[model samples]
Target: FVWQYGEDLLQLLNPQPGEFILDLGCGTGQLTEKIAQSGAEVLGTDNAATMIEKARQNYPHLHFDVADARNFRVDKPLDAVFSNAMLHWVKEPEAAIASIHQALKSGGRFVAEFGGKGNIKYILEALYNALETLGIHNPQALNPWYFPSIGEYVNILEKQGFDVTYAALFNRPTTLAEGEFGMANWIQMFASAFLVGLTPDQQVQLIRKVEATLQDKLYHQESWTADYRRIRIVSIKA
Candidate 1:
C-alpha cells in the first residue's frame, strides 16, 4: 500500500529547493528519491538495516542512514521532518514525536500519515480470533502497532511544543496484489510475531483460519483489501 499511496505524504510535505528534510522510516529510497527530485536535500533513515542498505543501492547519490525514530538526531537543524506509513510501527509515539520535534529547526514542519484509530480493526480482530481458536491468548504478540485518534496524536505533538496545523483521519481500503495469496503474504510479513510459539503446521492452519474469517469483508472481485484507517497531520515546531 505504501507503494500505491505514499505520494499522498509527499504532496503534503511539498519540499522546497535547498530545504533539508528527513525522511523518517524511508524504505528503499523510492520516496526519498521523489523528495530529491524536487531539489530538496533529503536523507532517508530506518531502523531496519536491510532497508537502509537497499535504499543506498537504489539511490547511491542520496543519503541513507540506520537510525531509530525514537532516538534519532540530526547533526544540523532540518527544515522539515516527513514520514509516511511508518509512525504506527513505533509503539513509543511520544518519543518519536519528540525526536522529530528536536530534529526540526524552529518553525520547521512535521508532516506525517500512518495507521489511525480503528485501523485494520476487523482484519486484526479476525487474526486474534483465529489465534483464540488455536488456544493462543497472546494479545501482546498481536499488538505491535500504535494507532491513535486525530485528537490523541495532536495532543502529543502539541505537548512537545508543536503547533498542530493540519490533521485528518479517514478510511482507506487498501487492495493487495496477488489476489488469492495476498493475506497469507501479509500475515507472514507483518504478523509473524504471533506465530513464534506455533509449529509450522499450526502456523499454516492459523493463517488459513484468519483468511477464512476475513474473506467476507476483505475479499471481493479477486482481490483482498485491508481495513485501513489513516491519520495525516502537519505540525510546525514552535
Candidate 2:
C-alpha cells in the first residue's frame, strides 16, 4: 500500500474544513477518510467498480463512486482536487487534466503526486529483459505506465489553465511487503499487462527471472526496495 509515502502528500494538500474535495482514483478510501477528518466534504472516486465497492464497504458513511479520471463530473465545482499515486496510469494526461480543471471552481487548487521520470527504473529493466527471454520482442509496447518529468507535466498543466505553484520530482525508494515474494507480487499488481497471453507457468518463469535479475541491486536483507521517483505538484485553476 502507498500509505507510507502518503503523509507528505496529505500535508501538502492541507485540506481545510468546509471545503469540497475530490479524491481521484482513491483506491480504498483510506486517504479519503483522512481527508474527511479535516472536516472537508470529500468524495472518493476510482475507475474500477471493484475498488469503489471496497471503498464503500470500508467507509459506509462516506461518499464513494466509480469515476474515470479522464471525464468524471460533479454537480458543483469543488474547492480542491487531491489525487495520490494515480495520474501516471492515465496515459492521456491532457484529457485527465481537462476533467480536473472542469470539476474545480476557479482559483481552486489541485494537489497530486504520481510516478515521476525514472520511476521504477531497475524493476522495469528486469521485466523487459525477462520478457525478451520469453520471446516477447516488443516489450516496450506492452508498458502501460506514463512517467513524466516535472517540466513536461507542468507545461501541460499550464497550457490547460492551471498556474503551477509548487512542483517537485524526487526519489523515494519504496520497501515492498511479503519479503521474498515482494517482487513477484509487485509485478502482478502493477505490470501484469506486459504478461498478457502468457501461460501461468510462463508468467511464473518470467517473474522468477526478473527477480533473479534484480536480486543484486534491489533485493537486500530479505526485502526488496523498488526504485521509486515521484512527482508532486500543487496548482491553481486560472
Candidate 3:
C-alpha cells in the first residue's frame, strides 16, 4: 500500500524514455525496476546495505548502490530523481534536498512521496506517553521518520535551488495485514526504533498499552487501520 503511493508521484515525474533517472533510497528496487521497464536508464541507491543487496538480487539487470540520501554523489547529473516512501527517513531535509539538487542537471525534476505531518500520530503519541510513564523520556533517543508540513519541506527545496512546482497532503487510512497478530507485527517492523532498551517483557507491555490506546481508532473488525497522512511533491532544479 505504501509503495503504491509512489505511482502517483511517478505520474507527476513523468519519466521519459532515454532519460537518466535515479531512485534515491530505493529499498529492494521495486520502483526502480518499474522505471527501467519504462525504457529509462535507472539507478537505485539505498543507505542500507541489506536493502541494496536484496535489490541487486531481485533486479540483477539494474544498478543498485549503497549510498546515503543526504550525501550521495553521482558521476553524471541525472534527468530526474525519484523517491517513494523514502524522504521521510532522511532526518536532515535540507541536506537531502541539497544532495538532490546537486545530483540533477539544470531543470531536472525531483519527485517523491513520504510521511507528512500527523502521519501515525496515534502510534507516536502512544509510544511517547508510554515512555514518559516509565520516566524514560529522552528527546535524543526519539527519531522521527516523517517530516511536517508542505511549507517547511518546500522551503527547504527552494533554498536548495529547486523550484517547487507541486505539493499536496492527503489522508490515507492504511490497513495492516489481517489476523490476530497483525497489529503486533506492524509495530515490530515499523516501530522497532522506539522499542530499544526495553526488556522483552517491558516491550510486550508497551505494545499492549499502545494497542489498547489505538484500539478504537486503528483496530477494526477485519484489520488494523494505520492513520497515515502522506505528502507528495514535485520540483525542478533551477
Candidate 4:
C-alpha cells in the first residue's frame, strides 16, 4: 500500500532539485528514494531502528536516520516535509506537528496522508464482533490509532501555526495481496495491539473469526481489499 498510496503524495510535494526535504516516518526508504529522484537532498527518518536499518541497507547511497516524529529536529530548516501512512500511529499528533513545524522553513510545505476518521471501519467491526463472541468486552481500549476527522486534524495543524492549504478525507479500498491469508496477515502486522494478553491460540482464533466475518466485502477473486480511509493534507508553516 505504501507504493500504491505514495504517488499522489509525491506529486503534491513536487520535490525540487537543490531542496532539502525530510521524509518523516519513512519506512525502508522506498518513498525517500522517490523524493531524491527529483534531485532533492532527502533524509529518511523513522522512530524504529529496524526500519531505518533496512532503509539504509536498501539504499546505501542515501541517508536514513532513527528519529521520533514527535520531537525530531533538523539542524537546518527544510524546504518541505513529506509523510505517508505514518501519522495516525503517533497518538500525540500535536507534538509531531510541532516538531514538523519547527523543522521547516517559514514558508515550507508539509504534505502528508494518513488514516482518517472511519478508517478500517469494517475490519474493526469484524474484530470487535469476534472479541465479543469470546466474552471479551472493551476492545476499544486496545485500539492504537488516532483517526481524526478533517476538522479535527486541520484544527491541530492551525494550532501549530501551519496554514492548511489542502485537506481531503476519502476512501481508498486498497488491495491486500496474499489471497486467503491477507486479512490475518494485515491484523498481525498493523492491528496487533488488540492481541495483547490473548494466548496464541486465542489470537489465531480471533483472527480467523475476523477474516471469516470480512470475507464477503474485502475478498474478491483471490485478493483482499482493506477498508482504507485516508486523510491527505498540504500545509505551509506560516
Best by lDDT: 2
Candidate 2 matches the true fold with a TM-score of 0.97
Q: Sorted by TM-score, highest first, which candidate order results?
A: 2, 4, 1, 3
Which residue pairs in model 2 clash with each other? none
Give the alpha carbon lDDT tens digit for every residue of 20-111 in model 3.
99999899998899899889999999999999999999998999999999889999999999998888887888888888898899989999
* Per-model TM against the reference: 0.96, 0.97, 0.93, 0.97
Q: What residue runs in model 4 are displaced by over 4 Å at the alpha carbon?
A: 1-6
TM-score of candidate 3 relative to the true fold: 0.93
Could you give candidate 2's per-residue lDDT for residues 1-238 as a string of tens digits? 3644558788999999999999999999999999999999999999999999999999999999999999888999999999999999999999999999999999899999999999999988998999899988889888899999999999999999999999999988888999888998998898878888799898999999998999999988998889999999999999
- Minimum summed lDDT over a 10-residue window in model 2 is located at 1-10
Indicate the worst ten consecutive residues by lDDT in candidate 4.
Answer: 1-10
Candidate 3 positional error at 215, Å: 1.1
User: In model 1, which residue pairs have backbone atoms overlapping below 3 Å?
Assistant: none
231: Cα error in model 3, Å: 1.2
List lDDT for all candidates, in order.
0.90, 0.92, 0.84, 0.92
lDDT of 4 by residue, 93-210 (tens): 9999999999999999999999999999999999888888877898877889999999999999999899999999998888886777788889889877888878889998998899
Instruction: State the number of backbone clashes in model 1.
Output: 0
